[PDB]
Give the backbone structure.
Amino acid sequence: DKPFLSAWPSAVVPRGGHVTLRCHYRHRFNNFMLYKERIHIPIFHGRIFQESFNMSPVTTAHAGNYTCRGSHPHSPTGWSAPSNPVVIMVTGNHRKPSLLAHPGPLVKSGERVILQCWSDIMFEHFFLHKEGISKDPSRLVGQIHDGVSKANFSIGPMMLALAGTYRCYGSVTHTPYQLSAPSDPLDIVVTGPYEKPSLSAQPGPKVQAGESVTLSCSSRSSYDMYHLSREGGAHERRLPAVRKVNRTFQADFPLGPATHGGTYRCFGSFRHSPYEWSDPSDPLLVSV
Amino acid sequence: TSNLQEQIGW
Amino acid sequence: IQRTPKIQVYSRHPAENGKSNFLNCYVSGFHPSDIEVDLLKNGERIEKVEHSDLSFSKDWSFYLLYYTEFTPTEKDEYACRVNHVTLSQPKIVKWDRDM
Amino acid sequence: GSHSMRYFYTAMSRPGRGEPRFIAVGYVDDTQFVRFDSDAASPRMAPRAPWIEQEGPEYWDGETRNMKASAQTYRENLRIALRYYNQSEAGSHIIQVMYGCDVGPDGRLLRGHDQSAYDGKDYIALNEDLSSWTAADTAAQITQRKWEAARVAEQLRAYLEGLCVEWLRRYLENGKETLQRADPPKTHVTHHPISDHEATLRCWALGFYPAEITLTWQRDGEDQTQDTELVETRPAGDRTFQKWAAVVVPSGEEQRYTCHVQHEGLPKPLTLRWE
């Protein structure tokens, strides 16, 4: 008689945010008591939740390790066995750490990437969390070297399930369920096995000031969007693909006024899947 | 034996 | 898109009072997959009931076999009780040796 | 005769009721031989037919490993389907997959299959050529563009021509005595009065394998299709099957009626009658 305890939309939640605990027992989101990691001490002086327990606005007092017990009337005890444990982690309590991808955020399908979390603050543990509904974070102890605390999260074999927006957090010794503010987000993109597009310049890759240059991304594969990336990525540009007379799917990226140029690559992608890209096109050097 | 899962989904 | 289950309650071998056998409840043609199935002896739930692994037909509708080892008698009444989203109330199908 | 191998996958989201569940089952004709359920404490591909139980530890580990990756792929597939269909994150949805091969008497490929469904309706299917797809709606059309762009049919065709046919052949030799020896049905006719003017005649077929069978009632040598009640073939629970056919007859006319049984374990069709 084990209930199913869950947190909605996420168990990793900012202070001031909202999270609901649900206790699914005997084909219902029925009555239950909540317990903290103390299997016989019900919280809020033995409060019986008549429905899902909505914690809003979220405070640091909500952070913790929970189990529930569903109402089991005719059993010796009027309550079920303990549920699965759900750890509510409350974010926004310390300065954010930094997050970096090694060798970079674009990962070939089947391969591996290191997500490095680091801080000047001495954090006991580091948490890596992919953006989404009902996502579980990974934890590593913080390593210490030359005044910095750090952890290396190995992600792979790369596939769509591992692609997305990642954020990392630190926690300090006496408050394990209290996380820092999140690091700046990192977009991890899976490349391939979708066929590489073709990248060309119009009228060509050699240009001088005051003259326009357009980069054309093309394929016979039905991509819905194209991504133009410049070596030493400041920001990727994206445009919808348009079907041509000869059945190619193309996008034209006009380079603006006084463009510095450099090395370019392009990628195709599909509607509703922004972190899943084709193999990169061959590089194109644009001269000014 | 089952088909080896494609790295690719829907 | 919902399909109500078809139900058949029957024995593995032709029933003979006092002879060990198996009581089956075969549920099929249903969608979605969530289903509640109970084998009853004189209105009470039999505890040791097993079921086959979830599978489906060419039309995509699900099928499951629920079963238990049992001994028929003249006195005992066996039935299968099924609940599904398409059912406002649980359906009871009594075991009939002739079907 | 001809034989077939199929894998059936069910992936189901259930928010607030459990984590997304993945169930895989394997069949050789009408016999289930393996299973995987992501809900077990330690999930593994597991034997379901005694003839597969003696496959070495390298077979079970290789299958477990592939099933774990499939559960991971289908969990993500449920997520993408919500974006495709603009559906709430609170609802329960189901993806179903069926794939496998059909071989002839020689043991050579007859037909390859790979079919998917979303919420009990066709989503995407591999064509008979094993090199093109049929998409049922605008959402599956996105999946088609991705699979054509990644050359998915090519990998499927190599499985269906090679490994699928080769493994089916190995399984047929493994379980030769239950898979390739057709068990004829045990038959009998029962009589049940309804009133003083009519009665029910029921023809039974029990303990047969394979599931395929034909039961018909004839009145003086004419087929009674319009008035015959035919129950769905059901499992006996011991890898054999059962079926019955009933006809309503006028009292004192039972002698005019004959039951006819056709099954591969029967060298000639059977003619039965009540007495």
User: Anything to note?
Assistant: The radius of gyration of chain D is 23 Å. The domain at 182-272 of chain D is CATH 2.60.40.10 (Immunoglobulin-like).
